[PDB]
């Protein structure tokens, strides 16, 4: 009934959040997270992002900034609030404030 948490990110970041307590294998045996290994390309990454976005129990979604950039043309289509996407930093690449999907709505943030 309640919402889950979903993650897309490096193996290290996913390990960290899993140790935090986010992971679960659903009745279909499909995890709520994905590690972005070099074998995983842009098309599959965005397929998983879209899956998280559609599925109603996902709730809060975490994505690193570089992966979000690689996913951007789906983050622009994402225009409903509840599936809350959070673009977060990583040891792989830093976070920056500019060009965040949600922050697009802010015009007074100089």
């Amino acid at each position: 009934r309640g919402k889950l948490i979903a993650v897309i990110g490096d193996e290290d970041t996913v390990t960290g959040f899993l140790l935090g307590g986010i992971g679960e294998l659903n009745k279909n045996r499909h995890p709520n997270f994905l590690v972005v290994e070099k074998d995983t390309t842009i098309n599959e990454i965005e397929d998983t992002f879209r899956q998280f976005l559609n599925r109603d129990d996902i709730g809060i979604i975490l994505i690193n900034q570089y992966i979000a950039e690689m996913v951007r043309h789906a983050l622009d289509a994402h225009q409903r609030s509840i599936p809350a996407v959070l673009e977060i930093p990583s040891k792989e690449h830093p976070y920056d404030a500019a060009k965040d999907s949600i922050l697009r709505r802010a015009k007074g943030m100089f």
Partner: protein, 350 residues
């Protein structure tokens, strides 16, 4: 005295010299001070290229990653160890195989965890640590059947003797994978200690202390970590290896222990562990008991080179170079994450 000086070099002299040559290459304290001051991972590559590692990293892509550096260091260690193993003879060969069993005991846990979660073993094999890779094909095309994997392990893997502490594939489904891992490791460590004592001579006298410390640190740390878990005292007591100097009544007072202060009380009776516990402040910002035990382990391994005619130097080299790989990985992590404040936490070797 077993006069190993008379007959060791007949079969193991070449590797005895070669492994010490390899040890001569492990980074010195000064080398670590050089690596500490690098600005970027490319700068680290350049400063590292002057050491034994040389151009091992030059063939990788321009955007260096600490994962890539770790993989390359592990690959180098594996290559060297496999060369020595291919040139070893029966007794030394068995000793080296005992060293590899430790990594096999984690690869097997990977395999069983994948099987009980019903995943293809071909996806698990790439994640295995190369030093303990399963060459045997009986452990392939398992069809995700725990019984198939268990029979494969018993019939075509050296861990057959260690799994006899367990009795059934049902144990794989029931027992937590950590309990399985640690029971296997206890069996392996006791078998290794018995093997070393049966080798006797300088090998025994120089290697047995290292495995005794391994048993004692296993006991201490298993106990300290088990407090906030469902793990019962009665099951915990089974995990302690009986080789360490704690064995009679020390392991017993630990099995009876229910707080860190009581674990420290058990440690107080041993000067070599009292010092580690007193030095391990364990409060935020300084050394933990894990760090102190790593330092003591490094000291014990370093001592293995003071004895000449014995196999213990190969185990000491493997563990020392593993520590050096983890040191370089840590320094790279600090350089990448700009956490310079704690870059000194590497354990110096020689």
């Amino acid at each position: 005295s077993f006069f190993p000086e008379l007959y060791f070099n007949v079969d193991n002299g070449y590797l005895e010299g070669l492994v010490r040559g390899l040890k001569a290459g492990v980074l010195s304290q000064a080398d670590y001070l050089n690596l500490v001051q690098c600005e970027t991972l490319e700068d680290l590559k350049l400063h590292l290229q002057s050491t034994d590692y040389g151009n091992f990293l030059a063939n990788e892509a321009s955007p260096l990653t600490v994962s890539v550096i770790d993989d390359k260091l592990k690959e180098k260690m594996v290559v060297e160890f496999r060369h020595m193993r291919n040139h070893a003879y029966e007794p030394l060969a068995s000793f080296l195989d005992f060293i590899t069993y430790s990594y096999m005991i984690d690869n097997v846990i990977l395999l069983i965890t994948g099987t009980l979660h019903q995943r293809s073993i071909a996806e698990l094999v790439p994640k295995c640590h190369p030093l303990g890779s399963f060459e045997q094909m009986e452990a392939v095309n398992i069809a995700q059947t725990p019984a198939e994997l268990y029979n494969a392990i018993l019939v075509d893997t050296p861990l057959a003797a260690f799994f006899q502490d367990c009795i059934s594939e049902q144990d794989l489904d029931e027992m937590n994978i950590e309990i399985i891992r640690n029971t296997l490791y206890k069996a392996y460590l006791e078998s290794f200690y018995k093997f070393c004592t049966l080798l006797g001579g300088t090998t025994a006298d120089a290697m047995c202390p290292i495995l005794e410390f391994e048993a004692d640190r296993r006991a201490f740390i298993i106990t300290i970590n088990s407090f906030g878990t469902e793990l019962s005292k009665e099951d915990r007591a089974k995990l302690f290896p009986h080789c360490g100097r704690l064995y009679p009544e020390g392991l017993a007072q630990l099995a009876r222990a229910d707080d860190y202060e009581q674990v420290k009380n058990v440690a107080d009776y041993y000067p070599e562990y009292k010092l580690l516990f007193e030095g391990a402040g364990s409060n935020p910002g300084d050394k933990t008991l894990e760090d102190r035990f790593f330092e003591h382990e490094v000291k014990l391994n370093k001592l293995a080179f003071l004895n000449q005619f014995h196999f213990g130097v190969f185990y000491a080299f493997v563990k020392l170079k593993e520590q050096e790989c983890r040191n370089i990985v840590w320094i790279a992590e600090c350089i990448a994450q700009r956490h310079r404040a704690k870059i000194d936490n590497y354990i110096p070797i020689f």
